[PDB]
Enzyme design. Sequence first.
Site, PDB file in Angstrom:
ATOM      1  N   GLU A  35       0.818  -1.218   0.000  1.00  0.00           N
ATOM      2  CA  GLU A  35       0.000   0.000   0.000  1.00  0.00           C
ATOM      3  C   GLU A  35       0.852   1.268   0.000  1.00  0.00           C
ATOM      4  OE1 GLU A  35      -3.071   0.472  -0.578  1.00  0.00           O
ATOM      5  OE2 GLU A  35      -3.983  -1.508  -0.311  1.00  0.00           O
ATOM      6  N   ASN A  46      -7.650   9.311  -5.633  1.00  0.00           N
ATOM      7  CA  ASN A  46      -8.478   8.393  -6.426  1.00  0.00           C
ATOM      8  C   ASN A  46      -9.282   9.143  -7.484  1.00  0.00           C
ATOM      9  OD1 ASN A  46      -7.665   6.186  -4.716  1.00  0.00           O
ATOM     10  ND2 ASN A  46      -9.111   6.955  -3.185  1.00  0.00           N
ATOM     11  N   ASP A  48     -12.457   9.298  -8.027  1.00  0.00           N
ATOM     12  CA  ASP A  48     -13.663   9.946  -7.522  1.00  0.00           C
ATOM     13  C   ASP A  48     -13.378  11.231  -6.731  1.00  0.00           C
ATOM     14  OD1 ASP A  48     -12.638   8.752  -5.239  1.00  0.00           O
ATOM     15  OD2 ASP A  48     -14.538   7.912  -4.572  1.00  0.00           O
ATOM     16  N   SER A  50     -11.583  11.322  -3.880  1.00  0.00           N
ATOM     17  CA  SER A  50     -11.174  10.971  -2.532  1.00  0.00           C
ATOM     18  C   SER A  50      -9.659  10.742  -2.529  1.00  0.00           C
ATOM     19  CB  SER A  50     -11.909   9.717  -2.054  1.00  0.00           C
ATOM     20  OG  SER A  50     -11.647   8.617  -2.920  1.00  0.00           O
ATOM     21  N   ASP A  52      -6.330   8.555  -0.444  1.00  0.00           N
ATOM     22  CA  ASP A  52      -5.870   7.526   0.501  1.00  0.00           C
ATOM     23  C   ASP A  52      -4.664   8.028   1.302  1.00  0.00           C
ATOM     24  OD1 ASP A  52      -7.762   5.910  -0.736  1.00  0.00           O
ATOM     25  OD2 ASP A  52      -6.287   4.784  -1.889  1.00  0.00           O
ATOM     26  N   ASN A  59      -8.953   5.518   3.072  1.00  0.00           N
ATOM     27  CA  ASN A  59      -9.672   6.335   2.084  1.00  0.00           C
ATOM     28  C   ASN A  59     -10.564   7.389   2.743  1.00  0.00           C
ATOM     29  OD1 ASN A  59     -11.001   7.312  -0.181  1.00  0.00           O
ATOM     30  ND2 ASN A  59     -11.821   5.342  -0.849  1.00  0.00           N
TER      31      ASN A  59
END
EC number: 3.2.1.17
Length: 129
Positions: A35, A46, A48, A50, A52, A59
């Site tokens: 990750e 991301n 959309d 958002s 992380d 998220n």
Amino acid sequence: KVFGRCELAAAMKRHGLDNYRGYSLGNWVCAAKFESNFNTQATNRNTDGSTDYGILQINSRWWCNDGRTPGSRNLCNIPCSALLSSDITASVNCAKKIVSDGNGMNAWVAWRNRCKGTDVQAWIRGCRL
Ligand SMILES: [Cl-]
């Protein structure tokens, strides 16, 4: 902070992640490696809108507040910046909530694709725990 492999394993164990909801320590170390490459300061945006955050790439769509993901939730009740600390406490406590939500570690795409069904014990091999 960029953790060493065994350093992170020992920190996670101390915070109660070993066998948490049936997931051995190796699963958590493997997830963090893929990750964030063990870097607490990792961020990724991301599609959309958002973002992380941190060592486990939590998220902002569901789990933390970053002030810039409209219509999102803050289920861990923390600002997303708290997940970037060299102290992993906030990330761990939030991860515990995520993994308990019904989908287990499948919430983490890199865990599903790169750790699940592999020899995850290899990730803590040689570590003083
Ligand atoms: Cl599960």
